[PDB]
Amino acid sequence: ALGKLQDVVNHNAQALNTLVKQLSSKFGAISSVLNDILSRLDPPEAEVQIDRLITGRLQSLQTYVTQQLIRAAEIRASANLAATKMSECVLGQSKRVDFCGKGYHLMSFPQSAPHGVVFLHVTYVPAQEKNFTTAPAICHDGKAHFPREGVFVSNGTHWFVTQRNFYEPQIITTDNTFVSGNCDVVIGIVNNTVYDPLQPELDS
Amino acid sequence: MSLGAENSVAYSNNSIAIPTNFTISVTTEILPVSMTKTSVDCTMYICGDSTECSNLLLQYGSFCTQLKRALTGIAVEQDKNTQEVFAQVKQIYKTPPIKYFGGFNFSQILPDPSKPSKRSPIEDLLFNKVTDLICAQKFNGLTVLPPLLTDEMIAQYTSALLAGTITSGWTFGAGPALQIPFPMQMAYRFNGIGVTQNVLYENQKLIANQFNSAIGKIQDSLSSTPSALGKLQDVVNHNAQALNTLVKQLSSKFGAISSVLNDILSRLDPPEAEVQIDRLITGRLQSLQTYVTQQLIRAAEIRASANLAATKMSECVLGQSKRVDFCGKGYHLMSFPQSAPHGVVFLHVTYVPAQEKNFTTAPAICHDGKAHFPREGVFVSNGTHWFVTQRNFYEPQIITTDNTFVSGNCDVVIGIVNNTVYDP
Amino acid sequence: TGVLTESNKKFLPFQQFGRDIADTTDAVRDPQTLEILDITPCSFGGVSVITPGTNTSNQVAVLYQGVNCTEVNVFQTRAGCLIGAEYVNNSYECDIPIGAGICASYQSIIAYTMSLGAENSVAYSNNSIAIPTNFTISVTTEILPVSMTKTSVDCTMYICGD
Numbered sequence: 176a177l178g179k180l181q182d183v184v185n186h187n188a189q190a191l192n193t194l195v196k197q198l199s200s201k202f203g204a205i206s207s208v209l210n211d212i213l214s215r216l217d218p219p220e221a222e223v224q225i226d227r228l229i230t231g232r233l234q235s236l237q238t239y240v241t242q243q244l245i246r247a248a249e250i251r252a253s254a255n256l257a258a259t260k261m262s263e264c265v266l267g268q269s270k271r272v273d274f275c276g277k278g279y280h281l282m283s284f285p286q287s288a289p290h291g292v293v294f295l296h297v298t299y300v301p302a303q304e305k306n307f308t309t310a311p312a313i314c315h316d317g318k319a320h321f322p323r324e325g326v327f328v329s330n331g332t333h334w335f336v337t338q339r340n341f342y343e344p345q346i347i348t349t350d351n352t353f354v355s356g357n358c359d360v361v362i363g364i365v366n367n368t369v370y371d372p373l374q375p376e377l378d379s
Numbered sequence: 380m381s382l383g384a385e386n387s388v389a390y391s392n393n394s395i396a397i398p399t400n401f402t403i404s405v406t407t408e409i410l411p412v413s414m415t416k417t418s419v420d421c422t423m424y425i426c427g428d429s430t431e432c433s434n435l436l437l438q439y440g441s442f443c444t445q446l447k448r449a450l451t452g453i454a455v456e457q458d459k460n461t462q463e464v465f466a467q468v469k470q471i472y473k474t475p476p477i478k479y480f481g482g483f484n485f486s487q488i489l490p491d492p493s494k495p496s497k498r499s500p501i502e503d504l505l506f507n508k509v510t511d512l513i514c515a516q517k518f519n520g521l522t523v524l525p526p527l528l529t530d531e532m533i534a535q536y537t538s539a540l541l542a543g544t545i546t547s548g549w550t551f552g553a554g555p556a557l558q559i560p561f562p563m564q565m566a567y568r569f570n571g572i573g574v575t576q577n578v579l580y581e582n583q584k585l586i587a588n589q590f591n592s593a594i595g596k597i598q599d600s601l602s603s604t605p606s607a608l609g610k611l612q613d614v615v616n617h618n619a620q621a622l623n624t625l626v627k628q629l630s631s632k633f634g635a636i637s638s639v640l641n642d643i644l645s646r647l648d649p650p651e652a653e654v655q656i657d658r659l660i661t662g663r664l665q666s667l668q669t670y671v672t673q674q675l676i677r678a679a680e681i682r683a684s685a686n687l688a689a690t691k692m693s694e695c696v697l698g699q700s701k702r703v704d705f706c707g708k709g710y711h712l713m714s715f716p717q718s719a720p721h722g723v724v725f726l727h728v729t730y731v732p733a734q735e736k737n738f739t740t741a742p743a744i745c746h747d748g749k750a751h752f753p754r755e756g757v758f759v760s761n762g763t764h765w766f767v768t769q770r771n772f773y774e775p776q777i778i779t780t781d782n783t784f785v786s787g788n789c790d791v792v793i794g795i796v797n798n799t800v801y802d803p
Numbered sequence: 804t805g806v807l808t809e810s811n812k813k814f815l816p817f818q819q820f821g822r823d824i825a826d827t828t829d830a831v832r833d834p835q836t837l838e839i840l841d842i843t844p845c846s847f848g849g850v851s852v853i854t855p856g857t858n859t860s861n862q863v864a865v866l867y868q869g870v871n872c873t874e875v876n877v878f879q880t881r882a883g884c885l886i887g888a889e890y891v892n893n894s895y896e897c898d899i900p901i902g903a904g905i906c907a908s909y910q911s912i913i914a915y916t917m918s919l920g921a922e923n924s925v926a927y928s929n930n931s932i933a934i935p936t937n938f939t940i941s942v943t944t945e946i947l948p949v950s951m952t953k954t955s956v957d958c959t960m961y962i963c964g965d
């Protein structure tokens with residue numbers, strides 16, 4: 176589960192171990208110990224041997240610094256991503272798909288971890304879906320009615336309007352539908368009644 | 380050079396421009412995803428078949444282990460990049476056998492049964508348009524490793540994403556795939572960008588024709604432009620050029636008498652042959668470290684591009700994005716993924732307003748001593764009459780109490796005009 | 804050092820050797836009989852070992868990368884020759900990645916073409932919709948590295964010491 180953080184710790188420790196291990200490399204010289212080189216040779220050739228050790232160790236150190244810089248760039252990109260997730264997932268609700276978890280994102284919780292952050296993404300996942308017969312519009316009194324915020328569904332005999340992400344059937348009225356045009360243009364329009372709230376009021 | 384055509388917008392305090400038509404624009408975005416996976420035998424590259432060279436090479440320590448480990452990290456990173464970009468669905472969705480989607484034609488993007496590769500016409504064109512070097516690179520101890528996901532499986536992942544986005548819209552990306560008719564899905568997408576469902580339903584045939592025409596234009600545009608696939612070809616060129624340079628560096632003396640180790644052994648005594656082999660080893664080791672360093676930098680660049688491609692796949696293909704210019708130029712409707720060699724091509728279907736018309740606008744309508752504000756639209760005037768319309772399409776409607784809300788009197792709003800508000 | 808295969812290359816009478824695009828020898832003319840030979844270097848490969856945990860088993864499989872199986876439970880893959888695993892026509896999820904669509908798992912060690920996912924056909928029709936009737940509150944984890952170990956190196960002490 177925590178492979179990324181442990182991987183970063185492993186790379187840092189392994190890099191330091193390799194850099195420490197590189198001091199035991201002759202680099203084409205008689206010995207890897209500078210004290211032995213001084214204690215065994217005259218300055219004209221000791222200078223050459225120390226030069227060989229210096230160039231090898233300097234190459235090792237430059238290599239280590241170069242990989243440290245590349246890893247620093249990778250960790251900086253990951254930290255910028257983590258800051259973006261903290262701003263958009265924890266400090267607000269995000270409409271970006273898959274940015275703050277799988278599903279419709281609700282909220283997020285930050286947790287500290289060694290060299291890192293763990294985001295607990297609380298998301299809403301739809302479940303227990305049911306088939307319904309759908310229509311683009313409802314034809315009533317020669318007018319086309321479209322849903323304000325939902326979708327027209329039919330359970331087999333009756334037509335209702337429900338919200339798209341949860342099944343809550345409601346009677347098709349003028350309050351939750353809007354009229355645009357006649358019934359001759361929309362392809363697939365079905366005939367159904369549209370209830371009027373004012374009709375019982377003026378009737379009684 | 381000219382920066383652009385000069386356009387002066389007719390700004391005034393009470394005039395608005397409302398679109399009266401639209402264009403369905405499909406645009407292409409080419410993103411590199413992975414590189415060529417390379418492995419280098421450190422001993423074979425630096426020394427070949429010479430035992431004495433290997434013995435002298437051992438004095439330098441764990442350089443060979445570092446280079447092998449770095450290349451292995453890049454090689455696993457490329458497969459991780461491909462998994463992140465394409466393997467984002469765990470269900471392999473399929474299109475219905477009757478390819479009718481309410482007038483919308485997806486032949487150019489769905490897999491072709493006739494082709495053995497099971498690729499789309501666009502994907503087949505992309506593979507065709509992206510192209511003893513390999514043998515020499517192999518012969519010098521450098522090996523290219525095959526991608527973990529084969530081209531047919533990447534095409535299968537794109538097919539599953541296309542089938543999910545076409546039959547289920549954005550539902551499959553957020554949980555179970557819920558079937559929805561494609562006109563209703565396009566109406567939902569029109570609602571996402573602030574246009575009512577009626578505009579999509581009334582103009583369904585025109586929108587389908589525009590989308591089909593745009594897809595055909597996209598295929599022609601890719602087939603007719605040589606510099607369309609420059610990013611993927613550029614990545615292939617850099618990888619091949621790097622391997623060629625690394626192979627070419629074996630023919631460098633590096634300040635020694637000869638570049639051939641066999642000649643050095645066959646011509647000199649061990650006291651001076653050790654020095655010459657040392658010169659060759661240090662030069663070749665510097666070349667290999669340089670190659671690994673540029674491979675790591677390119678790996679970081681490709682990783683950033685792959686992260687961007689995964690973000691585009693999540694936000695543009697598996698949902699509708701409200702980020703401006705992230706999923707094409709225009710108001711984003713939907714996106715289609717296409718596999719390409721070492722990369723992904725996104726077909727962004729966007730809504731572009733067109734045929735705008737001037738109207739006289741007001742912030743509020745004063746009726747009966749009350750200020751009326753639009754619930755979802757804008758007040759427009761064609762010269763004599765006032766109407767309320769949606770902001771992104773011209774559909775004038777009578778100003779009523781149903782589509783306006785009352786807040787305050789008429790004495791505070793600057794620019795309020797007097798007009799009647801109908802009562803149902 | 805290399806294999807000398809038959810060559811289809813028609814040399815001009817004055818030419819003796821042959822070189823690649825990258826200046827590596829790829830052909831030669833025999834000086835005894837005027838025939839052309841394709842010098843191709845002998846096979847080499849990266850030996851990779853595919854093994855499960857030592858907690859479970861000690862069986863291993865060997866992958867010779869880039870090597871045909873005739874030049875080394877032997878199966879031929881596009882990645883190379885896999886020895887020690889038996890190909891199964893069934894498709895499962897990837898456990899140990901081999902390459903070119905081939906993955907390995909322990910059940911003996913088997914090699915198979917990995918399955919991308921479970922096959923689901925959505926019942927698309929022109930007038931049917933699926934509406935959710937319930938929901939699941941899902942909490943998922945995302946682990947992101949933020950910082951590294953801060954390292955400082957004394958250049959003089961590291962290279963030269965005392």
Ligand SMILES: *[C@@H]1O[C@H](CO)[C@@H](O[C@@H]2O[C@H](CO)[C@@H](O)[C@H](O)[C@H]2NC(C)=O)[C@H](O)[C@H]1NC(C)=O
Nearest residue numbers: 307328329330331332333334335343344345346
């Ligand atoms: C579709 O839904 C409606 C409303 O829930 C159902 O109508 C009711 O059905 C129950 C049981 O069948 C009756 O007791 C009620 O009297 C009905 N109400 C009305 C106003 O008729 C309808 O039966 C459902 N259709 C199907 C096929 O299940």
Ligand SMILES: *[C@@H]1O[C@H](CO)[C@@H](O[C@@H]2O[C@H](CO)[C@@H](O)[C@H](O)[C@H]2NC(C)=O)[C@H](O)[C@H]1NC(C)=O
Nearest residue numbers: 313314315316317318358359363364365366367
């Ligand atoms: C919906 O209702 C309209 C009007 O009641 C129907 O249109 C009529 O259809 C009949 C038979 O097809 C024709 O003889 C009439 O001339 C039509 N009248 C008009 C005004 O168009 C329509 O058929 C109904 N649709 C459905 C699916 O039942």
Ligand SMILES: *[C@@H]1O[C@H](CO)[C@@H](O[C@@H]2O[C@H](CO)[C@@H](O)[C@H](O)[C@H]2NC(C)=O)[C@H](O)[C@H]1NC(C)=O
Nearest residue numbers: 387388389390394395396397734735736737738
């Ligand atoms: C809206 O009206 C303005 C002004 O009445 C139009 O702006 C003019 O456009 C023409 C053509 O480019 C220019 O030559 C004029 O100089 C512009 N006038 C000003 C004051 O900027 C504008 O084109 C009209 N909009 C539409 C859609 O017709």
Ligand SMILES: *[C@@H]1O[C@H](CO)[C@@H](O[C@@H]2O[C@H](CO)[C@@H](O)[C@H](O)[C@H]2NC(C)=O)[C@H](O)[C@H]1NC(C)=O
Nearest residue numbers: 399400401402403584585586588589592733734
């Ligand atoms: C909106 O624009 C579309 C095209 O983008 C118009 O459709 C064109 O209509 C003309 C004349 O009616 C035809 O000659 C063209 O062939 C049509 N083009 C297409 C692609 O169908 C449409 O008429 C415009 N609508 C309005 C109200 O201006």
Ligand SMILES: *[C@@H]1O[C@H](CO)[C@@H](O[C@@H]2O[C@H](CO)[C@@H](O)[C@H](O)[C@H]2NC(C)=O)[C@H](O)[C@H]1NC(C)=O
Nearest residue numbers: 478479480482483484485486487500591594595
């Ligand atoms: C969907 O589009 C494809 C291609 O864009 C159409 O196929 C063309 O069909 C016409 C007439 O049959 C031929 O003249 C073309 O050569 C075909 N093009 C290709 C690339 O095959 C297809 O008819 C469209 N409609 C459907 C329902 O698939």
Ligand SMILES: *[C@@H]1O[C@H](CO)[C@@H](O[C@@H]2O[C@H](CO)[C@@H](O)[C@H](O)[C@H]2NC(C)=O)[C@H](O)[C@H]1NC(C)=O
Nearest residue numbers: 738759760761762763764765766774775776777
């Ligand atoms: C502004 O729009 C309104 C509504 O479309 C126009 O009013 C109609 O105009 C037509 C033709 O001029 C007449 O046949 C109708 O009788 C008018 N309806 C009403 C209710 O008056 C109006 O003319 C438009 N104004 C301008 C300057 O074009």
Ligand SMILES: *[C@@H]1O[C@H](CO)[C@@H](O[C@@H]2O[C@H](CO)[C@@H](O)[C@H](O)[C@H]2NC(C)=O)[C@H](O)[C@H]1NC(C)=O
Nearest residue numbers: 744745746747748749789790794795796797798
């Ligand atoms: C909008 O209507 C109001 C009320 O009918 C107008 O306010 C009147 O304006 C006249 C002349 O300017 C004054 O003599 C009245 O005393 C005003 N009455 C009130 C209650 O303020 C207003 O001028 C109209 N605005 C426009 C642009 O026609």
Ligand SMILES: *[C@@H]1O[C@H](CO)[C@@H](O[C@@H]2O[C@H](CO)[C@@H](O)[C@H](O)[C@H]2NC(C)=O)[C@H](O)[C@H]1NC(C)=O
Nearest residue numbers: 303304305306307558924925926927931933934
């Ligand atoms: C909605 O109805 C369709 C068809 O009536 C169902 O799809 C069937 O699902 C079963 C179980 O997987 C398959 O064996 C059939 O082949 C499917 N039929 C078709 C035409 O695809 C679907 O399961 C129903 N949805 C729900 C939620 O029950």
Ligand SMILES: *[C@@H]1O[C@H](CO)[C@@H](O[C@@H]2O[C@H](CO)[C@@H](O)[C@H](O)[C@H]2NC(C)=O)[C@H](O)[C@H]1NC(C)=O
Nearest residue numbers: 300301302303304342935936937938939940941
């Ligand atoms: C929606 O799903 C929840 C669970 O996700 C259902 O709650 C379960 O109800 C059954 C029987 O009523 C119990 O045995 C379980 O213990 C409940 N689970 C939990 C977690 O409370 C709920 O009934 C479902 N609602 C509908 C309308 O189907």
Ligand SMILES: *[C@@H]1O[C@H](CO)[C@@H](O)[C@H](O)[C@H]1NC(C)=O
Nearest residue numbers: 389390391392393394793794
């Ligand atoms: C409206 O705009 C014109 C120029 O665009 C300006 O002269 C005028 O002062 C503005 N109206 C008000 C009330 O400031």
Ligand SMILES: *[C@@H]1O[C@H](CO)[C@@H](O)[C@H](O)[C@H]1NC(C)=O
Nearest residue numbers: 816832833834835836837838
């Ligand atoms: C080489 O000598 C052999 C033996 O006499 C002869 O058969 C062959 O043709 C010779 N090749 C050339 C090029 O003269």
Ligand SMILES: *[C@@H]1O[C@H](CO)[C@@H](O)[C@H](O)[C@H]1NC(C)=O
Nearest residue numbers: 475477479481927928929930
């Ligand atoms: C509705 O869909 C079926 C198959 O899904 C198709 O045969 C039929 O033609 C479609 N209806 C129309 C009006 O095209």
